[PDB]
Amino acid sequence: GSSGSSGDVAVRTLSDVPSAAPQNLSLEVRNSKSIMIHWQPPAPATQNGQITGYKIRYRKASRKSDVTETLVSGTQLSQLIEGLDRGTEYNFRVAALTINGTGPATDWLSAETFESDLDETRVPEVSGPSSG
């Protein structure tokens, strides 16, 4: 057989402001006018200080210039953004904030609301035991 691959990425920059953002970012669309935001806190090692809050900003796929500012609590890992329209794409982003100032922002995640009020249901799966 055979194979071949390579890769290496890192950074050696220091500063007062934090250079780490929340992971596991998700957008649980609650309604055609509202959207639930679920994000997880960054690693501790990176955390250059205690978090005071997050800055959730979003814009319209048609109007990027138009952005909305939203500040939540520090111990808040979820925010509900209401005031949207049905059948319309919207970009959301979450950023961490600390006493040092502001932090990085999460990629631009686009979410399309529900053309109407339709609730979907899902079913779980089977799980087998084990030993060791």
XYZ file of C-alpha atoms in Angstrom:
132
model
C 0.000 0.000 0.000
C 0.897 3.681 0.250
C -0.218 7.122 1.427
C 0.692 10.795 1.677
C -0.489 13.849 3.597
C 0.667 16.865 5.609
C -0.626 19.842 7.568
C 0.260 22.306 10.316
C -1.538 25.388 11.634
C -0.775 27.525 14.685
C -0.314 31.068 15.988
C 2.164 32.852 18.254
C 0.459 36.204 18.824
C -0.272 37.781 22.207
C -2.665 40.556 23.231
C -5.060 41.805 25.908
C -8.289 41.067 24.039
C -9.382 37.418 23.680
C -8.734 35.635 20.383
C -11.142 32.736 20.894
C -14.801 32.358 19.929
C -17.623 29.979 20.937
C -17.848 26.555 19.296
C -20.683 24.145 18.510
C -22.651 27.110 17.162
C -26.229 26.256 16.197
C -29.475 28.013 15.272
C -32.669 26.279 16.397
C -35.326 28.141 14.412
C -38.223 28.504 16.849
C -40.622 30.383 14.572
C -40.804 32.084 11.174
C -40.169 35.350 13.017
C -37.857 34.145 15.788
C -34.682 32.055 15.914
C -32.969 30.362 18.859
C -29.179 30.599 19.051
C -27.152 27.861 20.746
C -23.398 28.278 21.187
C -20.735 26.769 23.444
C -17.935 28.531 25.367
C -14.339 28.401 24.065
C -11.513 26.433 25.677
C -10.234 27.603 29.089
C -6.580 27.775 28.052
C -7.483 30.271 25.327
C -9.851 32.233 27.563
C -7.741 35.319 28.267
C -10.030 36.264 31.139
C -13.514 35.843 32.586
C -16.353 36.310 30.099
C -18.814 39.141 30.724
C -21.146 38.538 27.797
C -21.564 37.681 24.123
C -22.344 39.868 21.111
C -24.870 38.243 18.779
C -25.021 40.079 15.451
C -26.996 39.196 12.323
C -27.781 40.654 8.900
C -29.983 40.085 5.850
C -28.681 37.983 2.959
C -29.957 40.865 0.831
C -28.635 43.643 3.067
C -25.283 42.822 4.668
C -24.675 46.465 5.578
C -27.715 46.281 7.856
C -26.657 44.538 11.068
C -28.297 44.190 14.482
C -26.414 44.401 17.779
C -27.341 42.065 20.634
C -25.559 41.757 23.980
C -26.346 38.912 26.377
C -25.161 37.827 29.825
C -21.832 36.132 30.474
C -23.330 32.911 31.812
C -25.750 32.959 28.879
C -25.137 30.315 26.214
C -28.453 30.853 24.430
C -30.328 33.813 22.952
C -33.686 34.182 21.203
C -33.780 36.639 18.301
C -37.358 37.631 17.478
C -38.611 39.990 14.786
C -37.955 38.129 11.543
C -39.890 37.354 8.361
C -40.965 34.010 6.900
C -39.275 32.514 3.852
C -36.164 34.637 4.327
C -32.490 33.836 4.894
C -30.648 35.444 7.809
C -27.002 35.365 8.887
C -26.166 35.087 12.588
C -22.888 35.261 14.510
C -21.816 34.975 18.149
C -18.812 36.603 19.815
C -17.333 36.503 23.318
C -16.620 39.622 25.374
C -14.345 40.207 28.365
C -12.932 42.980 30.549
C -10.100 43.262 28.026
C -12.658 44.413 25.476
C -14.253 42.373 22.700
C -13.626 38.946 21.207
C -13.707 37.048 17.894
C -16.890 36.291 15.953
C -18.212 32.975 14.641
C -18.440 32.285 10.908
C -21.454 33.598 8.997
C -24.161 30.970 9.481
C -27.212 31.468 7.266
C -30.605 30.238 8.465
C -33.844 30.105 6.475
C -37.014 30.627 8.511
C -40.149 28.537 7.994
C -42.467 29.797 5.255
C -45.199 29.125 7.816
C -45.894 27.859 11.334
C -45.009 24.183 10.922
C -43.704 22.101 13.825
C -41.686 18.999 12.942
C -41.254 15.916 15.130
C -38.428 13.375 15.250
C -38.025 9.916 16.783
C -35.092 8.559 18.831
C -33.062 5.422 18.125
C -32.218 2.121 19.817
C -29.183 1.698 22.069
C -27.490 -1.517 23.152
C -25.550 -2.084 26.394
C -21.927 -3.193 26.721
C -19.154 -4.166 29.135
C -15.402 -3.842 29.580
